[PDB]
Amino acid sequence: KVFGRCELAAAMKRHGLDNYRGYSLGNWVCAAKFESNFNTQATNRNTDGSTDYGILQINSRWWCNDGRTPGSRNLCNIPCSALLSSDITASVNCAKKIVSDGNGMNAWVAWRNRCKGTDVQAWIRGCRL
Ligand SMILES: [Cl-]
Numbered sequence: 001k002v003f004g005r006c007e008l009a010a011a012m013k014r015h016g017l018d019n020y021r022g023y024s025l026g027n028w029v030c031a032a033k034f035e036s037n038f039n040t041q042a043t044n045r046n047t048d049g050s051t052d053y054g055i056l057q058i059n060s061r062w063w064c065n066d067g068r069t070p071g072s073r074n075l076c077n078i079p080c081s082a083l084l085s086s087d088i089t090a091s092v093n094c095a096k097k098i099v100s101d102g103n104g105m106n107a108w109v110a111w112r113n114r115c116k117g118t119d120v121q122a123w124i125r126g127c128r129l
């Protein structure tokens with residue numbers, strides 16, 4: 001599923017992400033834009049052989065099992081394929097565990113490089129929430 005901008009904001013708000021650990025809704029939408037282009041089915045392979053999955057590009061070396069990343073952990077306790085569904089529930093819950101582990105949204109390289117310190121509120125302008 002390829003979300004619209006305001007559609008994804010409303011879905012994110014409903015699942016508890018607005019202001020979660022101090023990050024306003026605009027930050028999560030901006031990170032989803034540059035991680036996956038709003039596409040739940042996006043996958044990308046890293047140099048160490050681990051893979052990134054879904055709307056927020058979650059990594060198989062720490063967070064999910066895909067059966068092909070040796071020695072990795074399954075900290076969110078799911079198969080990585082569940083992160084690709086059109087229902088964003090599993091991606092949201094795992095993301096909540098990630099942003100809580102000490103380093104906040106800095107865990108997402110594209111947030112750090114393209115969203116941090118910008119006007120992230122613009123990402124929800126015009127939306128009915
Ligand atoms: Cl923080």
Ligand code: NA
Binds near residue numbers: 062063064072
């Ligand atoms: Na894993």
